[PDB]
Structure formats: C-alpha cells, structure tokens
Amino acid sequence: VPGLFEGEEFTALMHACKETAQRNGLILDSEEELYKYFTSQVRRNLHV
C-alpha cells in the first residue's frame, strides 16, 4: 500500500525487515531491496 508506511513508520519497518532477512538467510541493505522483501512476505501470508 503506497504511503501506508512512511516517515516514522518506515523506520521500524525497514529495520524489522533486515532483522527478518538475516534470519531467513538473506542479506538486504538498500531500502528498495528491503521493501520488495517486505511486499513479497505479505503476498504469501495475508490471505484476505
């Protein structure tokens, strides 16, 4: 959701992203590479 996460939110989100990435054995630094990871994770965990 474009904009849903921005500013203050985007901070915790990004960190929690690389925190999860390291676990799954995936090294992600750039915020753009991290977002793709976050987006994909939701695509296969939400189910509306």
Side-chain angles (χ1 to χ4, degrees), residues 1-7 9-21 23-26 28 30-32 34-39:
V1 185
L4 197 64
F5 284 123
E6 61 182 3
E9 305 301 311
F10 205 42
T11 312
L13 178 71
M14 281 307 97
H15 258 298
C17 276
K18 199 255 290 165
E19 180 184 298
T20 290
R23 300 186 177 94
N24 274 36
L26 306 176
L28 289 123
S30 56
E31 282 171 66
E32 187 174 300
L34 281 158
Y35 201 52
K36 290 170 159 295
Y37 182 67
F38 179 58
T39 278

